[PDB]
Amino acid sequence: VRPR
Amino acid sequence: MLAKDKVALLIGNMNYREHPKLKAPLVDVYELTNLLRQLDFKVVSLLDLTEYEMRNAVDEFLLLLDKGVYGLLYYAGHGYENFGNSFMVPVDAPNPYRSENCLCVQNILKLMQEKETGLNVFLLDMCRKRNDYDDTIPILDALKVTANIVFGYATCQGAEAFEIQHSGLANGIFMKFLKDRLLEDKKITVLLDEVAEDMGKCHLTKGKQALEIRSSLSEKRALTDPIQWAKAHELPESMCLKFDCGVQIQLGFAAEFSNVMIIYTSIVYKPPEIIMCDAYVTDFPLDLDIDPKDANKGTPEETGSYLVSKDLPKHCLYTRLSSLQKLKEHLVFTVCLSYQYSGLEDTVEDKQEVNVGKPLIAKL
Numbered sequence: 001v002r003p004r
Numbered sequence: 005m006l007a008k009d010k011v012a013l014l015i016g017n018m019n020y021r022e023h024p025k026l027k028a029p030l031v032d033v034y035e036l037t038n039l040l041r042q043l044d045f046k047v048v049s050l051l052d053l054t055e056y057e058m059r060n061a062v063d064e065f066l067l068l069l070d071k072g073v074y075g076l077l078y079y080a081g082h083g084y085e086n087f088g089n090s091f092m093v094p095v096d097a098p099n100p101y102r103s104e105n106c107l108c109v110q111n112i113l114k115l116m117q118e119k120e121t122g123l124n125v126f127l128l129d130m131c132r133k134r135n136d137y138d139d140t141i142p143i144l145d146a147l148k149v150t151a152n153i154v155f156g157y158a159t160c161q162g163a164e165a166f167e168i169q170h171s172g173l174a175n176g177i178f179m180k181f182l183k184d185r186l187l188e189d190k191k192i193t194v195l196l197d198e199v200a201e202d203m204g205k206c207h208l209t210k211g212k213q214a215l216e217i218r219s220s221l222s223e224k225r226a227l228t229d230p231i232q233w234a235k236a237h238e239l240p241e242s243m244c245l246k247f248d249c250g251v252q253i254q255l256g257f258a259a260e261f262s263n264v265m266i267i268y269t270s271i272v273y274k275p276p277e278i279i280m281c282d283a284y285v286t287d288f289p290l291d292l293d294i295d296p297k298d299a300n301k302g303t304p305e306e307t308g309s310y311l312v313s314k315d316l317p318k319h320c321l322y323t324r325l326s327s328l329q330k331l332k333e334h335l336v337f338t339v340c341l342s343y344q345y346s347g348l349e350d351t352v353e354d355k356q357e358v359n360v361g362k363p364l365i366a367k368l
Contacts, residue, residue, distance in 0.1 A: 001208075003164035004026060004082055004130045004176070 005225045006232045007122060008072030012040050013065035014049040015058060015092070017081030022099040028167035029080035032129060032179040033261065034310050036078055039186045043227050045076065048236055048262045050329070050365065055094040057329050058107050061365075062115075064236065069119040074229070076125040077112060080176060083130025085161055086138055090128055100137040110144055117150055123225050124150075125192060129158040129178045131165050151222040156182075156196045159213045166213055173310070177209050189228045193219045235367050237262060240335075240360035247341050247354050250275035253283045255339065255358065256320070260311055262365045263328040266304060268320035269339065281343035285323050288337045291330045299323040331366040334359050 014036055016029030030051060037049040046068065050061055069075045082093040084106075091106040098105060109126060116124050147153075158165035158178035167176035175183065181202040185195050200215040237259065245253045252273035258266040269283050288294040300321040304311045307324035316322070325335075336359045344351050362368070 001169035002024075002026070002167050004080070004158075004167065 005223055005229050006072075007074045007229045008070065009068075009231055010043070010045045010074040010076075010227070010229075011065065011068045012045045012047045012076040012078065013061060014040075014047060014078040015053055015061065015081070016049070016051050016079075017053060017093070017095050019052045020082065020095050020097070022097065023082055023093070026081060026167065028171070028174065028176040028179075029129075030310055031173050032080045032176050033078070035175065035183055036179060036186070037261075039183065040076070040227070042187060044231060045227075046233055048233060048365070050263050051261050052095050052327065053329070054096040055105055055107070058092065058094050060329070062107065062112055066115050066119065069116055069121055071120040072122040073119070074123040074125070074225070074227075075116050075119075075121050076127070076227070077109075078127040078129065080129040080179070083128065083132065084135040084138075085132040086134050087141065089144075090130075090132065090157075091135070092128075092130065102135065102138040103140045103142070110147075113153065114144060114147055117148055122152060123192075123221070124153045125156075125227075126154070127156045127178075127182070129165055129176055132157065132159055132161050132163060134162065149220070151220050152225070153220050154192050154196070155216070155218040156199070157216040157218075160216045163213060166209055168208075177203065177206060177213055178215070181206070186227065189226060191221070191224045191226050193217065193221055195226070233262075237364055238367055239265070240363055243358070244272060245339055245356060245358070247356065249278060249341075249343055249352070249354065251278065251281050251283075251341055251343060253339060253341065256317060257360070257363070258311065258316055259364060260309060260324075264324065264326045265328060265363055266307070266309055266311060266316065266322055266324055268316060268322045270317070270320040274343075277346055278343050279346050281341060283339060283341050284321060286338050286340055288325070289331060289333065289335065291332055292325055292327055294323070294325065328364050328366045331362055334361050335363055335366065
């Protein structure tokens with residue numbers, strides 16, 4: 001749910 | 005297959021100044037570090053590096069590499085990919101940013117090949133979307149055919165790599181699956197192929213993140229192969245400070261990353277004639293930017309440390325010193341002591357400077  | 009030595013640089017960027025902050029790189033780096041140490045790698049693990057610090061660290065890594073040596077780079081944090089070149093983005097990158105603010109993985113690879121490494125492994129835990137602001141078109145020299153290069157990308161070109169929002173100490177998706185395969189005694193390509201299939205079962209990321217493997221490794225080399233930091237991981241020794249009034253204070257030091265150290269203090273002796281005494285640390289070098297509201301906590305957890313109460317002595321006060329690579333001079337701080345004598349009314353205050361030099365990566 002959180003991109004890099 | 006044999007290694008002459010096995011060396012790894014792991015970098016995890018989280019505290020971005022101008023970009024969305026990340027959380028899991030901390031745990032991902034910590035856990036990969038320990039797994040690699042089980043496989044007999046010399047590991048340098050570093051968190052929250054600026055562009056200048058990332059290049060310094062790669063330079064140090066490259067020094068450790070020589071003919072036949074296995075070298076492995078793991079990077080967890082923001083990244084992008086333009087025109088076949090992958091870039092790692094440092095925590096001080098401007099917004100927008102471009103290739104000049106970042107490290108190009110292909111440059112690192114080229115430098116490693118010149119050391120005649122026996123194996124080059126890149127595990128890139130980062131997004132691989134294009135950077136529209138970066139219109140540099142720098143063609144690098146064609147790499148030599150050394151048939152010993154393996155890339156494991158957390159995601160595919162033009163896709164994102166993920167970690168789980170609000171998930172405490174959970175790994176990013178790549179490490180979540182890599183962690184359960186890394187110790188297998190199998191050619192590194194086969195190992196990664198297995199991780200790819202494990203990830204293909206992760207419901208959360210299907211259609212958005214899949215491992216990509218690229219390899220020209222033509223020998224059956226593995227991270228487990230037999231081998232047939234030195235000045236980079238020096239920790240100050242525990243010390244027992246005796247104050248004038250007789251109180252003695254134990255000061256201990258623990259490494260959490262190559263650039264993060266935990267100090268903890270406890271009263272080891274309080275003379276009978278003293279009724280109460282507290283000891284705390286203060287006046288750390290300004291470079292380390294320690295906030296005193298974050299120091300001298302009753303638990304390692306309260307300092308933002310990955311370390312928990314069971315990996316460190318109990319009943320101390322703990323202080324987290326991150327960013328040790330910024331330490332220009334000597335790590336000098338003050339151990340303060342407050343105490344009171346039986347029968348007296350005045351709170352007495354003594355202090356003592358302590359100098360432990362340049363610990364861990366600060367050593368340069």
